[PDB]
Amino acid sequence: GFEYNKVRPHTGTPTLGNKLTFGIPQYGDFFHDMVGHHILGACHSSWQDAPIQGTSQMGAHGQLQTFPRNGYDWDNQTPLEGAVYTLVDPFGRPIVPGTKNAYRNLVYYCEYPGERLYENVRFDVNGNSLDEYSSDVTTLVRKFCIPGDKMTGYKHLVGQEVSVEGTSGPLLCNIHDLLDIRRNVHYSCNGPQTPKYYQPPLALWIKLRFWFNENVNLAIPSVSIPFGERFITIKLASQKDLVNEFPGLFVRQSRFIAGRPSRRNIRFKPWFIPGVINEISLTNNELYINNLFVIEYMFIGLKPTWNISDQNPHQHRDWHKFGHVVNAIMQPTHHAEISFQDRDTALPDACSSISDISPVTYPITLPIIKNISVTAHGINLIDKFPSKFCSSYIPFHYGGNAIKTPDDPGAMMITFYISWDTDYVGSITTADLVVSA
Amino acid sequence: GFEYNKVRPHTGTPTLGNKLTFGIPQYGDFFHDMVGHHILGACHSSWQDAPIQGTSQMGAHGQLQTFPRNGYDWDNQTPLEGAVYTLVDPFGRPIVPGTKNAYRNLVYYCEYPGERLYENVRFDVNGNSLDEYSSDVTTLVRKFCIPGDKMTGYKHLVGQEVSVEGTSGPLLCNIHDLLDIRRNVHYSCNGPQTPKYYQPPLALWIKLRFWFNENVNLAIPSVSIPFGERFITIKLASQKDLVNEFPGLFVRQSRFIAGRPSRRNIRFKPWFIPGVINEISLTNNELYINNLFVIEYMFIGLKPTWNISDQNPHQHRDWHKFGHVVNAIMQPTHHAEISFQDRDTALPDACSSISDISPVTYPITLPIIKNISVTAHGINLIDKFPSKFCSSYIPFHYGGNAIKTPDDPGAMMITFYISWDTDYVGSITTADLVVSA
């Protein structure tokens, strides 16, 4: 029987957005990949005040947020016939205007909150730092290395929600040849990525990757190496990088269009103002070090710089994506035609176009590079090749069972000077590479 | 070429809820894991009579089922304005009240019907019974041992339905930068778990698990062991454990609320009375025996006693779950606002709140123990550890490719006196464990 013993930092009082040095000096004859606990805190936002019917206050990210007057369009200049505006809670509850402390912004964690935490890690022993890496290398490893079976539980370690399915009871159906009972299936999930008023404290169990900590026989001896000089440095993530604000207030619009079929259209538009986010502490953050008793196939990934840049409105869920993405919006309406006079009965006397408050956003990913050309001086390597070959067929036929087929066109496999022949040129291309595998 | 030969029981006339002794005396020089066929029968329920508008008959599980009068709430005491009640078939068809033989209760099999069949099995040869096991250890093995790839077909052996997907044709969408055609995907399924009026006869192909029947080289010789004294005992499940009743009658309630927007709300509530279920036989129940011609990592699971207890309303689909669960309900409505007078056009003249007959139930699972402490006398083992470590990281890093990552927080992995530090204390905790793996 073997037991893993913990260790505490010596610097003390960990803070977000600052460098932390941990000893891990000498505990264990042999050591392998470490585990770091991190217990987060509450994430309630600051109280805000409802706007006035004429307000046109400046918003965030350079986008103006307006509260239109009655009888106007979203802008306060062009007159629109039969437009009435009201304030509503994202859940549909009314919100009274002009009242102090009327609503609170929702707070939601960025996708994979535990992955952006280690933006930079250094493994060093009295200078001459042995190992460097960051978040992009971890993402590239995640998309390829870990098997698809060992996934769901791994999604719980980094604070990512997982989906659960429910049913809807029996339903009657017709069967065509040349009646039955069937059941419907729905998928839904909740967790850190779901915007909530008050976030339960998270528990990140972050895993550390190393070249010599993948096999028990590859561990370096502790006696030979200097035990007292080992000092692992970690750059904690910025407080503004993990959490984010979702609008806690909506400007409902109602319309009325004349003609033989009266049409009542209802639309929504968020009122987003960046408030103040409560400080989030990192308590009980020990590293449960696991202590026991006794050229090749190459990965690359291409990412637009806009994915990491703060100017991206959806930077919290596009940072890990390889390849520029677009948003597809499906707005579903609830039509209903009614007739009152039961004489002419030709066209609906009245109609309705009720629409949901929040749309359905699909992050469609598209290839960024039309062609690849890796022309090194020593070896010609690959030139004028399509992206689909290195994206799909190479992992399919090479790698074996450990490798998992890529899902995004940005990253690819080639079995250093690298060039591109893309058309979406904006000097935003950034490359990440792994060769030790 | 090798062919497997069958064998029939010697007791004869198998019955549900009684012990059956099967020979398997001597057929086969070497034998491995057995297979048992079981063909079930019809499951039509008994005819019942529609209630009267004032009836308040006693229901099942101690819950009163009422048919409220006009102008009252669900209870027959508090007056409610504008409430009208009617009887409806779960599929929406009207049901006339006070008519003899007016409806039939729906009959549906419990989740994994073939897994509860073998509530207890004994492997013995002239006394000194060699092997004992039951359903819970098989559930644990299913949740951990069998790979995720070998799943769908295995889901057909134990009579569990599998989902199928359909499409909805082209739809027009918008793409935002800095129009397209897309298709929607829906999932639905039918089978034994779907409540149906008449259940086709099932076909269970149940598999038997053993320590020495996992490898061909580990099979004990038949000549050395006593062939004539082998007698395998199986305790078949009770007839009330597999099948269950779903309400075949619903009490539709309609309302009307005065005001500027005149709403019309429709709600439903089941009328559930436990009828008589037709006897289900076990015919053609041969065992197609497979006959051919010639400390460590430990798995534990924690389950509330309410999961198995008959007092649980959803015991048929919670028995295999590890960890207490709750039910989340999304009731979807169909709003539609209409205006008649086209001269005010500010507040909707009328509204509708049509609701579905059956809600969408999500079985949300929650951890039962906030801490674990396994303190044995000989070895301290583990003490004061979080459940997330033994639930997620240990299977992720230990086990290899054979193990599958757990989905439920109740079960965990630890590489016998076991203690717990839970807060949901009700003397309902039950532990299952396996160590031979």
Epitope: E81, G82, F256 | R260, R343, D344, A346, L347
Partner: antibody, heavy 122, light 108 residues
């Protein structure tokens, strides 16, 4: 600089017939309604009639219906109001006004750009 | 009918309030209060067409809301050019518009 001008007001014997003409400039008269508001001396203001955008529909008040005939002329952008069966109470100030359609549409809600008004006496 | 003040006075640079009320009932958003102004021998100018909305070109020193079941118009930082009249109008029934009396506001 949109302008509205009323004409046709003056001294008149009771029981006669009167025509009030409202003309506009600086704005598109096609896509706007025309309302007429009467203000009695030493009293409040009252609403009189409504004419639609293209004259298809019209409405009136309870105490003046049957004697008032509102009409439009979109050629040279002029609205007419014929009034008959004159009595002494008609002494007031009449204002031809424009209107948008927010919330309520036909009776008018916003009522931008009131005219100077014309005084009519018996 | 609509009840409104007969007369009202204000000192220069002060704050003034005006109230518009019903005979029997209360006042809510559905009534649609509207506040105008009428200087002598000039056309009336729209000030507050809904409860709190105002058109373009009107100085931002005007306000208005519903308080105490009345329509309230508040003027802050009034100048000496407000020697005019103020009246209230409301919307009842389905197509009924009722105007109110006028206040000859005076600045000392």
């Amino acid at each position: 600089q949109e302008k509205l001008v009323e004409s046709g007001g003056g001294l008149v014997q009771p029981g006669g017939s009167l025509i009030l003409s409202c003309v506009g400039s600086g704005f598109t008269f096609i896509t706007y309604e025309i309302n007429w508001v009467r203000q009695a001396p030493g009293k409040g203001l009252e609403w009189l009639a409504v004419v639609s955008k293209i004259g298809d529909r019209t409405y009136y008040a309870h105490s003046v219906r049957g004697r008032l005939t509102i009409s439009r002329d979109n050629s040279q952008n002029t609205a007419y109001l014929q009034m008959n069966s004159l009595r002494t109470e008609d002494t007031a100030r009449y204002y031809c006004v424009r209107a948008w359609c927010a919330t309520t549409c036909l009776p008018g809600d916003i009522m931008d750009l009131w005219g100077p008004g014309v005084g009519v006496i018996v | 009918t609509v009840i409104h003040e007969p007369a009202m006075s204000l000192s220069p640079g002060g704050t003034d309030t005006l109230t518009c009320a019903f005979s029997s009932g209360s006042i809510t958003n559905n009534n649609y209060p509207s506040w105008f102004q009428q200087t002598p021998r000039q056309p009336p100018r729209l000030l507050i067409y809904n409860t709190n909305n105002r058109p373009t070109g009107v100085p931002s020193r005007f306000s208005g809301a519903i308080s105490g079941n009345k329509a309230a118009l508040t003027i802050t930082g009034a100048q000496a050019n407000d020697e005019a009249d103020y009246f209230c109008t409301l919307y009842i029934s389905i197509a009924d518009v009722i105007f109110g009396g006028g206040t000859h506001l005076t600045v000392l």
